[model samples]
Target chain A: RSYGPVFEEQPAHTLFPEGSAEEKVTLTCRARANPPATYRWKMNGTELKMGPDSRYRLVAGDLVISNPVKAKDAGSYQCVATNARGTVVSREASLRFGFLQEFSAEERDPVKITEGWGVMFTCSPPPHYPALSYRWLLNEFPNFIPADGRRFVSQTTGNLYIAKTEASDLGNYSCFATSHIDFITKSVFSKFSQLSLAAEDARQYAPSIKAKFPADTYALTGQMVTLECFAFGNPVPQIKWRKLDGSQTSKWLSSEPLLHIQNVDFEDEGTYECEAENIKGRDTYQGRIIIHAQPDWLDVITDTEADIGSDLRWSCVASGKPRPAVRWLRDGQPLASQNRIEVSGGELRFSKLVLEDSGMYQCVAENKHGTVYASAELTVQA
Target chain B: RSYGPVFEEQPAHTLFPEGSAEEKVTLTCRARANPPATYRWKMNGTELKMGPDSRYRLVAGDLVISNPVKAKDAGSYQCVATNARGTVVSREASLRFGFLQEFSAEERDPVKITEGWGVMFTCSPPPHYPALSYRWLLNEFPNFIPADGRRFVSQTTGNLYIAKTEASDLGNYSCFATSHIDFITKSVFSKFSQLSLAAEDARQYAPSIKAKFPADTYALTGQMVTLECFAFGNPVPQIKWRKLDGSQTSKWLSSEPLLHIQNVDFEDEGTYECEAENIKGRDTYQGRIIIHAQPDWLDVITDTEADIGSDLRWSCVASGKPRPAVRWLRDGQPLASQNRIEVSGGELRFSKLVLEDSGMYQCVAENKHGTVYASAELTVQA
Candidate 1:
C-alpha cells in the first residue's frame, strides 16, 4: 500500500514561480507511472493541441504555458495522461488577479410530492469533493429535524434527509456547503408531500352500482324481502329464498306474504315464510296473511312456449266449488272475433304472429269471491 | 238397407212452345228421404221468396218464374237437404235452350318442364244436354287438331304436344271447343326453364380487409409475443401472416417469436402482406410496421394517466455497444430538460409524470451501428 507516496497525486497541485509583469512564470506538474508515461496538456478546459492555444506547448511528460502569461493564460489549467496501466485526469486551475468577481450559480432540480402525505426533500450537492456539512436553510418556516438516529443519516455529507416526510413539510430544503475553496449552494423544494401513497387501499371505486332500478318489493301479499346486490363484485354470494319450513326457492315473487295460498287445503296447512339471503347478508320474514278454508284450484292452467305463427291454446280445468270464468288477452289487449281472430272452445288461434304481438300477455280467471291474473312475456324475434 | 231409386234431383228441363211471350216456367227442386222435410227453392241462382214476386214465386216446393220466358233464366241448379238423422245432397241440373243457356268451360294447365323437356297439353268440355257432338277451334279459327287419337279428342279430350321441347318451346296455347249448344275457349302459356336465387345463396357479401394500428410503433426489448389483431370480415375471413418473401406463417400466436421475429426480422422491415379471402373474393392490405430494437431510451416524460404531482417514471434501460442518447417527444415535440426530467444511466426518468405526459412518443436511437426508430403511445386514460 505504501508506493513511495505517488507523485503530486493531486492533479491540481503545481509550482508556479512568479517573476514580475513581463517576466515568465514557470509552472510544473508531474506524475510517476511504470515505463515512463507520456503526458498531454489541456488548457482553458479544451483538449490541448500543439496550436489550439498559441501560448501553450508540450514538453517531456509535462505541459508548459510559456511566455509572459496574459489574461487568457491567467485562467484555470488542467493536465491528463495515458500510460500502459490507465489514465489519470485532473481539474482546471483558476488564476487570481487584482480582484475576482462572483458568478451567480444555482442548481435547478426540485423535490416534489403530493399533498396529505409524508415527504422528504433532498438537496444533492454539486459534483465535487465529498460534500461537507450542508448548511440547511428554508424558504418557508417548517419544522426541521436533523440527523441523529437510525431514522436519519447524512452519509457523505451529501445533505440527504432521512427525516420524517409529511405534507405540512413544504417550502425549500436547501443546503450551503464548501469544497476546497469554492463555495456552493444547493436547494430543493417540495410544494407538497413525497407521499408514496401506495393506494391507501386499492381505492375502492365506490362499488359503482350500475344505473338500474334497485331491487324493490311491493306489499301485495305478506312480508316481502328486497335484497340489493353489488355489481362487478368478486366472491359472488349465492342468493336463495327459503320458506319457514326450510324449503328453498329460486323463483321470484312479488310483494307481501312472501308465500301465499288463498285456500287452507292440506298443502296450505304448513308454516309459510320467506328468507332472502346471500353470503353478505340475509333477510327473513314470516307469513303475514292467514289462509281461509276455500276450494283450492292449483295447477288449473298451463301454457307452453309456442313458436311464432303457431296456434296458442288457453285451457283451464277448474276444480273449485264454483267454476271460474277464463279470459285471455294478447299483449294486454282483449281478444275479439275481429282482426283475423279465430276462437273455438279453449283455443285462440292466430294465423300469423307479427312483431307487433311481442309483449306481456295476460290470462285471467275470475270467480264470485276473487280474481287471479297471470301474465306472460312473449318475444317475437326476426 | 235399400234406398229408393231416386230421380236426378232438380232436373232442369226446357220446353220450347209456339212463340209464347208470357210463358210460365216452373222449375221444381225436390227430394225424398225416409223422413221428409220442408224445402226451399233457388232459381237462376236467386233465393226466391216462397211467394214474393207476382212474376216469380215458389209454390208447393216448385220454383215458378212468371214471365215472357227468355234466355236468362236457364242454367245449372241444385238442391241440398239435411235432417237430424243425417244429410242428403243432390247433383247439379242443366237446362238446355234451343238458342243457348249459360255455358262455361274450365282452362286446363299447360305443359311445364325443365329446359329441353317435352310435355303434352289437354282440355275437357263442360256438360251439355243430349251428349251433343262437338267441334274444335283455336285462335277464333278452326286450327284445332282433328278429333283423332293422336291430335285431339271428342271435345271431352283435346290435346297437343312438343316431341322435344326446345328453348323456343315457350308460347301460349289456347283451346276452343264448340257444341250445338255452347262455345268456349281458354289459353295458358308454357315456360321452358326457371332460374332463381335461394335465400341461403343471397347472403354472400364482399369481403373486406382493413389495416389499422393501435400505435405506429412499439419498443422491442424482447418481451411477450402475443400481438393483438382485430381482423374482421364478412363471413369472417381466416387470419394468417405472409412474409414479403412469399412464405406463410402460423395463424397462432405465442410468446416466442416475440413480435414474430421468426416470420420477420429487421431485414423484413418493408411492407407486410396481410390477406383476407373467401367465397366473395380476396382482399389484400398493408399491416403495421414492426421495428425490432430496444429503445435507445424510454421515458414517459409526462402522462396524464399518472397520478397528479406523483413520481411517474417512463424509463427504459437501453444498451448498445455505444450508448444511445434518449430524448422524449410529447405530441411530436422535443422534451427539454425541465424541473421533472432527470437523465441518468442512459435512461430518462420523469421524476413526476403528470397528465401532460400522455401522448405519442418516438424513441429514435441512432448510433455508429445504425439508426432505428420505435414508437409507443403512452395512454393515460383517467
Candidate 2:
C-alpha cells in the first residue's frame, strides 16, 4: 500500500435562522481530522478577538458562539484549521434580523346597504390569513353599537358590527386584524338603506300559506278553515307559523295543517302566521281572508288549435297543497254534461265538437286550502 | 319571447400576426345582427367619406381600408346599424401585428493574415442555401484584383490571388459576397514577409522498400531509396545524388533506381549513393561510404537548426539473427573510458549537445562468431 496526505475542505457547518431585532443567534463549525488541529474563527471576514472571558472557545475543536446576539452581530463566520501537514478552512455562513409586529387603523370602505336601507361591513386581514384575529369598529370607538339599541351582530367570525343604519348611515367603516407579531389594517365605508313596505307589490303581497277558500268573508268562520302568509327576505329568512286569532296567538301552530277548524262554522276568519329570519334579523307577515264567490266564470282557454269539430279536449291547472276539486262551466253559465259532452278533473271533452262549444269553458276547484276558478275558450276554424 | 339586441362590432376582423412591422394594412368593419346590417369605417377617431375613391370602402359588406398603415393606424373603429326595431354597435376587435425576421451576421474575429508568400485566399460564403455570388476587393478598393495585372492575378471565378507576391504587396484583403437582395463583406489583411516563396516542394524522397529472408534483405521490385540531405542557408539549397554505378545523377524526388541490378549480387554492395549541394556559393564537399550488409545497430539524432549549446539525444537499436551484444564508443574508446559518461543497456540515451560532443559516434555490436560496426560523423549545429 502506498501512503499520501489526505487533504480536504473543512466539513460540517450551520447558522441560526433570523429573528426580531436584538434577538439571539449562534453559529457552529466542526470537522474530522486524524490528529486534532488548532481552530480559529473569522467573523465577517475578520478574526474576532478572544476576550479575557474567552467568549469564543473551541470545545474539543467544535467552535460555538453563545447568545444575546445583536443585529450588528449579523454577518458571515467560518473556521480555519492548520496541522503539521497543511491547512484547510470551511465556507462562510450568514445571520440576519429586523422585523416586528404592529397595528394601524383604516377608517374607509363604503358601507353595504340592505333592502330596507342598511349597511353591510366586514373586517378582514389585509393579506387575508385565517389565523389572524380581526376586530371591527364603528367610528373611532370600539365595542360600540348605535343608539337604536340593537346589539352589533355578526354572521362571520370576528367582532364585525354594522351600526346605526339609517338612510343616512352611508359612509366609511374600518377593521383591524393581527397575528402573533404581525398586524393588518383595512377599512370599508358604505351607504346603507332599510327595507320599505310596498302597497300593491304582488310579490310582496302574502295571499296565504294554506290553500282554502270558504263561502263567506266574515269573522269567526271556522268551517274547517285555514289561513296562511308568505313573506320575502334576503338570504331566505327563517319562517315561523303562529296563530294570531285569540289568546292562542301566544301558542304556535306546530302542525302543518295550520288553523284547521274541526267543525263547519263562520267564526274562524282571523290572522295566521309566517315569519322569515336571517343574520340581519327576523320579520313577520299575515294572511288574507279566503272567500268563495261562485267560482266566478274563471277563464281557461285551450290553445285555439284544440277546438270543437276537431275532437276538442281541455285541461285547467292550478297550484295549492290540499288538491282542489274541479268543476266546469260553459260560457258564463254553470252547465251539466249531456250525452255528447263530459268533464273530468277540471277538463271538458267534446266528441265531434261543434261551433256551439266555441264559447268559454270554465274550471272551479275547492279544498281545505282554497277554491280557485279559471276558464278557457276555443274558437273553431271554419 | 322578448329579445335582447345583438352585439355588433366592426371593422369585422383583421389579420395581423402578433408583432410585425407596420406595412400596407387593411381594416375591416363588420356589423353583426339578427338581420344583416351595413357598416362604415373610421380612422383616427374620425369618420371617413364612404365613396369609391375613399381609402375606406365596403368590401363585400365589411368596411375596409387598403392604405399605408402604421402604429398610428391602431385604434377603435365604430359601426352603427339601425333596423325597423332599434340600433346596436359591437365591441372593438384589437388588431396586433406579429414580429418580423431581421438579423445581422456578427463576425467575432475581425483581422486575419494571408497565407505565406505568393499564396491566394478565397473565403467561401457561410453555408447558406441559394448561394450568393462573391466579389473580391482590396482595402475597400473594388475591382482592384480583376482590373489590375502588373502585380495582381485572380481567377475571375471570384477567388482573389496575389500573383507574384512580394513583401511590398502587404495590404488589407477583403471579399464582398452578395446577392441582389443581401450582401456581406469579410476580409483578412496580412503582414507579408520579405520571402514569399511557395516553391511547391513537390521534390520528395522515394520510400525505401525491403524484404528479409534467411539473414539477407532483398530489394525485389519497386524498392525506393530516399537520400534526405538537409542543409541551412539564406536561400534553400537543392539536393542531387550520384549513383554508385558511376552513372546518372538523381534528386531527392527521383523515384527511379540510380543503378538497376536484377539480383543485387553482393558486389552490388559498395558506396551505393550520395548527395551534394550548396548555397551562397559555398564550396561543398562530396562524401562517400560503402553500403555493406545491414549493420546490427542504427542511430538517429536531432538538434535545433543552427543552434549551439542545446540538448541532443541518440536512440540506438540493434537487430540480428542471433541477438548481438551492444556497446557504445567515443573516439574508438568504450564509454567507461571516461567516468563522466553514463551508458545503459537500452534503446535510447541522452547527452547534452555540448560543442565538445560534436565530433563522431560509433555503435558497435559483436556476437559469438564476429563483430560489426556502424559509425556516424556528427556535427554540432552553429
Candidate 3:
C-alpha cells in the first residue's frame, strides 16, 4: 500500500563544521513515497529560503551547502519530505561551528616551593567547544609530563599537580587542551607558567610530618575512621601511635601506615598522638578525633488515646553525643506557650486535654551532625 | 596496676514478663573486683527500695523480682556496682511487657460474589507486640487455607486473598496473628468472616475475561508496556489480541497471554483489543495505551558572549509527545516581561543587552510526564 513519505535517509549532525570557505556540507533527506518525495529544509524552525546560488544546490532530494559561513549559517536543521500522499518531518539535526579559542594571554604567578611540599598549577584555559582532554608539558610542546606517582594532570580541569616538590620537578610548565566536538578536532596550548625552587639548607632534620594530615577530624560512629601518619627523617622515623587521653586498647602501630579503627564507637574519642622518633630525635603532632552523631530515639511517643477531659504528657527524648536539641510540633505547627500547657526540655505537659489536642505531634531533634523526626497521633474521645 | 572493677556481665533485657504471681524474673550484674563488688538496682532512675519478701531476693550480684505487675512494674532498669574501687553505673536495660489483645467482638462483613472474580479479606487484628506472623483458618482451628494456586496469606499484614472465587472457595474464614517479640510466642484468632457464592453463575462463561486487565494504562516511552488478557470458557478460552487502531504491525496474538511491547514509543499509542474466542462465542474489552513522554531538547541555548548594547536572542525549544510548556528563569528568579526583553514561545529576545543581564539563565520544560532543566550563562562584553 502506498503511504506518506517515511525516512529512507535523514539528516544527522555535522562534524562541528570549521574550515575554509570552500568546505562543503551535505544533508540527505531521502524518503520512500509513492511518487518520489521532494525535500525542504528548516533552520531554527523557519524554512531555509535559499535563492539560486552557485555555492548551494538541491541535488535530487538532498541539500548541499557549499562553503557555508560559520557565524551566519550555523543552526539547528530539520528536513521535510513531501509527496502527493502527505508531508512528514524528520528529527532535527544541528550544524554547529565548534572551535577552541587560545588560552589566557595574561601572565601566571610563579610558584616558589621547597623540597618537602606540594603544589597544583591551574591552566585556566579559555572556554571553547563541547568537551576537552588535557596534558601538561615541560616548557615546550610534546615534552609530556607523565603521570609518574608524584606528578599528575587533571583532564576535567586543566591542572597540574606536583607532590613532594623535589628539585627535579622545578621547571616551566604549559598545558595543552584537545577539544572533542563531533567531527572536528583541534588542540590549543596555554601560556607557560614557572615553578621555581628556593635554596634549601638542612638535608636531614627532626622527623617532621608530611602533608595531608587530619588536623581536627569529625567522624561518626560505625563509620571507618582511618588515621594515617607518615614522617620524614635521615633514617625514616619509626613511628608509634598512642591514644593520649586513655582509650580501651593496649597499643597502636606503624608497620601498617593507616590505623583503621574497626567498629568505631563513642570510646574512639580523644586526642591521637603520632610520635615520630629516630635515633637523632623525636617529634609529635596531635589531632583530636571529634565524634559527631545524629540522634537515636531513646524515648519516643506512640499513637495514644485519652479521654477529652484528662491530663496528657508526651516525651521526645533522643540520645546523641552532643545531645540533640528537641522541639515539638502539634499538627505541623510549633507549640506556643499557654497557661495550661507547659513545654519542658524534650517534654510537653498539658494540665487538661481538649479535642484540639487530638492531632499528629512531631518531635524534631537537630544538631550540626544531622536531624531526626518522629511523629505520633493523639486521639481524644469525648 | 590496681584499678576500678569492670563488668563481667551487665544487666540484659527480660523475656517480656508474663503469667501469674508464681513467675520469677532475674537481671544479672556481675563485676570483677577485689572486695567483690556489691550491686544495687535502680528503676526509672530511682533506687529500687524493695522491702524484704520471700519472692524477691538478691542472689549475690543479681536481682530476682518475682511476679512483676504488668502496668506498674514495667520500666527502664539499671544497676550500680560499688566496691573499694568506687561506684560505676551500668547502661539502662528496659523491661517491656508485650501481649496480643483479643480480636474484636463485632461481626465482620460477608463477601458475596460470582465465579471468575477475586476477593481479599483484611484481618484487622487488635493492637499488640513488636511484630507478628499470619495464617488463615477455614472452618474452626487449623483447617489451613493452603496456598493451592488460588489462596494467599500475608505474614507482614494479616490478610487472606482468594482468587478465581469458585463455589469451592465459599467458606467461613478466620485469621490468626502470632506475636513475634523476642523469646515470647503466642497466637490470637480473629472473628470469622464468610465468603458466600450465589446460587446461579451460568456454570460456564462465554469466553469472558478473567481478573486484572489493563484498564486505560499510561505508559511512558521506552518503557515496557505489559498487556495481559486471560479468559474463561467451557474449555479454557484460547485468547487472541488485536491492536484495533492503525499500527505498523501485522496481526497481534496470545498463545502466551501477555502482549509485551518492547521499546514503547509515540507510534505505539492507541486502543488495544483482547478477543477471547472458544466454541461458545467471542468477547472483547478495550484499553487505550496512552504514551506519555518527557522533553528532549530540540534546540538549546549555549553560553554566549554578546557585545554590550547589541540585540541578542536565545532558543529553548524541546520536543515531547505532548508539547511541553517552556519557561525561563534568570539567576534563580522567574523572568518578567519587559519592553527590552520580549519572550516569544520558547525564544527570549533582547532589544539591547546590558551588564545586568550577565548571569545564569535557565530553561525549564514541564509536562505530565516529568520536568527538565537546561542552563546557560550570558556574558556581556565591555
Please, what are the lDDT tens digits per residue for candidate 1 over residues B106-150? 344444555432244543434333322233343334343332111
The candidate 3 chain A region of ten consecutive residues with least summed lDDT is: A245-254
> Individual DockQ of the candidates?
0.00, 0.00, 0.01
lDDT (C-alpha) at residue B222 in model 1: 32
Give per-residue CA lDDT, model 1, range A1-382, as digits (tens).
1111113532443323233233444345565655565566666666666676566666654566665444556566555544543344443455432211221265445555433222334545544422344434445334444433211223333334322233334455554443322332323332322223232222112111211122222222222323222121111112222222211112233332112233222212222334333233444433232222212333333323456675555543332324456666553246655565565433455556665555444445555544544444444444
Looking at model 3, give its docking quality level.
incorrect
Q: What would the per-residue lDDT of candidate 2 be over residues A1-382, giving only the tens digit for each residue? A: 2111121433233333334352444455553444555667787768777765855656654555555354556676666654433334454555543222333353344434443322334443343322444444444445334323121323233334322234333333445444442233333322221223223212222211222223233332223444422223333333455533311012345322224445422122234455545555655555544322222223354435454457766766553323356766564345667867877766777777776555444466666644554434356655
Fnat across every predicted model, in order: 0.00, 0.00, 0.00
lDDT of 3: 0.69
Clashing pairs in 3: none
Using Cα atoms with residue i matched to residue i, what is each candidate's TM-score against the true structure? 0.15, 0.20, 0.30
> Could you give candidate 3's per-residue lDDT for residues B29-137 as a string of tens digits?
8767656777888888888876675445788778788777667678877777666534555655767666688798998888887665556788898887655657788
Ordered by lDDT, highest first, the candidates read 3, 2, 1
What overall lDDT, based on C-alpha atoms, would model 2 receive against the true structure?
0.41
User: Chain A only: TM-score of every candidate?
Assistant: 0.22, 0.27, 0.51
